[PDB]
Hints:
2 copies of one chain form a homodimer.
Chain A: H1 11-31, E1 39-40, E2 54-58, E3 63-77, H2 79-85, E4 98-111, E5 118-129, E6 135-147, H3 153-168, H4 174-178, H5 182-189, E7 195-202, H6 207-218, H7 221-230, H8 239-249, H9 251-254
Antiparallel strand pairs in A: 1-2, 2-3, 3-4, 4-5, 5-6, 6-7
Amino acid sequence: PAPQDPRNLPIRQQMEALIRRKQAEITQGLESIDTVKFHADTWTRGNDGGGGTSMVIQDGTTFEKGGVNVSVVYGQLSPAAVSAMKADHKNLRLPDGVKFFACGLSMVIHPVNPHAPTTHLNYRYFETWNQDGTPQTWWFGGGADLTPSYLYEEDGQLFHQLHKDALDKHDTALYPRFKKWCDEYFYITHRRGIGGIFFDDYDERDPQEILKMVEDCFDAFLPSYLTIVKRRKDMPYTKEEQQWQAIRRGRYVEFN
Amino acid sequence: PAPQDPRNLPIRQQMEALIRRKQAEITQGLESIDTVKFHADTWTRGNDGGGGTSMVIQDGTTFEKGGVNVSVVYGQLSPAAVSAMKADHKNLRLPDGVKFFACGLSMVIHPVNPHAPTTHLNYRYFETWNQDGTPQTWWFGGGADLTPSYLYEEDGQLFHQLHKDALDKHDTALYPRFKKWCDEYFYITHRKETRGIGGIFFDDYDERDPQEILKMVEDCFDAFLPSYLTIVKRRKDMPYTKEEQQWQAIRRGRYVEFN
């Protein structure tokens, strides 16, 4: 192939290259345990948006519906837009519109078998520009998680372990903080789920290092998800169970 | 129209009637502030499932993508099937499979304007049957929430307020319990995270007479349009650039959510 991997190019270029590479790696990986392939989403819209491509999988023997998208955007933030984003971004300062760049990969996969879990993954980068085009205010965001129909603790444990290992390669203080905590909190305070990791407005380290952190996080996905799906996709289940799980999670409207 | 309402028919029939009525009410309500109409989801996939219909809206001037579905299912839960669900159902017991019925409405709406929020709503009912066909083990589940792109605290407050009002008509102790707004607990660990709106959620709920819970569900349904249409109307015409919309799609993974 041809993905770039040095350290000299602007973060925006390295990040776009990274997500385009992972989109191909992930679709290929998922296809390795199914019987169908992903295909470009050439749906008729008016303003489809995005800059990259949208890959969709459907009616497979393992994955009923899924999509992996890469989007890149160049634009400007008006004073009003900045004002609406300010509270979630510690360094976003209005100082007349300001140019920005953003890109990210987003995906959602829904297995056919209720014993296998749905997964969501998203890694993105955002930066406003200085007059000279260099990054002014920037941050990374993203993470990944599992939403089970039938819950298997071992699966949640493996998913978390590999993402923890990814984050530990940079700072062991990251995983405990990035671990999704809310649902678990409500579960305890009240008399269940899997979750995963999530971070946003993350600009606390050298961006070149966060780039690598994101790459390592991406790399915790296939080893955990493929392993999990392999051990659940061929488990027995009745049409009734599948139908109830669909009602419980409203899957029909999720992919329509 | 033709929906039923008396507390004489079995809960399963009353609930199915309720969700079908609300599916029509909700799609009409949403269409009232858009220029396009919902249409049937006639896709040739592996399994359609459900016993009702899947209404979908797309490329509207107000709503970009959205769906409202009603599904109904009958069948027998094998001993192994029943055993795989007991984990989170206080009264679901082992006792040759047992017949069951379940139904529910689910929906997700994505507005075009990033100043307007995405919403998810789901209300359902499940019951196993006795030999004479009456309910043995049963429960209701549900919830509704908002997922903002651009965040407006006033909108989250209205959404929560109307759902609180609906629950208060039954027991003021319910809302504080069903409420799920993570932001409220950021303080415990000085957590600095992205703001959200949350909503209300409940499951395996069988704590009161089913006829009363059915009414509770109807009241919760009726908190939706008054809050959501009000919110969308005050945000759908706010200025925004194509790029702003694209960024919000990148942080929320919209394109894939559409599928």
